[PDB]
Design a protein around this ligand. Structure first.
Ligand SMILES: [Ca+2]
Ligand SMILES: [Ca+2]
Length: 279
């Protein structure tokens, strides 16, 4: 299948070179997989989700996304126009408030919730969790992320936006999950993107168009935007049977575009998410 005039990020992950505008993907499009978006919530009623999104848990007074951030990330995972895996099922877990903030205890609870809740869902092709959040180092947060991964969920987390080594941030610094840096449309490391040896992979993160609350769209930038590209790609590859939750991060790195990015510090991987599609 081919989506013409796609957002640049979608086009980039189906090409060996920058500057193309078509997103090429297999029609299966992540059908039968499930992705938990652990964030500010999801505006499930947005037409772009086509009924494939639902809120399953909130830690605040409402389950509504009053911020927009969660809806944007979910859109990059699996909206019709802006998503990587256009037929995946989306589950929202609201651990962040409408200002985009949350306590580590609540974030941990949200991760343990997903590890349990997945056992109650029909996700025959597998389960992914996308975490576009983080803060300073915390061994308890890292431990929660490791548990979620261990339970059989492909965990993707943002590297963070401090232009620093991700080793000092959580859950970014947990080695067992898939830590995602950001790049821009000219194959440069995004100027804000964290780096370091703990990074596994880069995805598009600068100027990413996706869904927003109030049934709208907007373009924003962050490692928050790169993470759902990788989460969506994992769901997509798991549906095709190419990999499993336990090894998807490794498989994505193995099959990535190598050496394409500029402004990568020595010791950081030069690997850009790529779906290897051939018609
Ligand atoms: Ca290339
Ligand atoms: Ca890792």
């Amino acid at each position: 299948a081919a989506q013409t005039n796609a957002p640049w990020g979608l086009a980039r992950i189906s090409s060996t070179s920058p500057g193309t505008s078509t997103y090429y993907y297999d029609e299966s499009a992540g059908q039968g997989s499930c992705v938990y978006v652990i964030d500010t919530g999801i505006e499930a009623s947005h037409p772009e989700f086509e009924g494939r999104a639902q809120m399953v848990k909130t830690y605040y007074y409402s389950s509504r996304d009053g911020n927009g951030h969660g809806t944007h990330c979910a859109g990059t995972v699996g909206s019709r126009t802006y998503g990587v895996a256009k037929k995946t099922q989306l589950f929202g877990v609201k651990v962040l408030d409408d200002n985009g903030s949350g306590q580590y205890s609540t974030i941990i609870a949200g991760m343990d919730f997903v590890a349990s809740d997945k056992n109650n869902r029909n996700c025959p092709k597998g389960v992914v969790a996308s975490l576009s959040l983080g803060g300073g180092y915390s061994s308890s947060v890292n431990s929660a992320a490791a548990r979620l991964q261990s339970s059989g969920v492909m965990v993707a987390v943002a590297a963070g936006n401090n232009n620093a080594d991700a080793r000092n941030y959580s859950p970014a610094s947990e080695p067992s999950v898939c830590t995602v840096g950001a790049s821009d449309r000219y194959d440069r490391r995004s100027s804000f993107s964290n780096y370091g040896s703990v990074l596994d992979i880069f995805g598009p993160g600068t100027d990413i168009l996706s869904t927003w609350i109030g049934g709208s769209t907007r373009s924003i930038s962050g490692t928050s935007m790169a993470t759902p590209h990788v989460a969506g790609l994992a769901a997509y590859l798991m549906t095709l049977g190419k990999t499993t939750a336990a090894s998807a991060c490794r498989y994505i790195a193995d099959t990535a575009n190598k050496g394409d990015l500029s402004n990568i510090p020595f010791g950081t991987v030069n690997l850009l998410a790529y779906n290897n599609y051939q018609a």
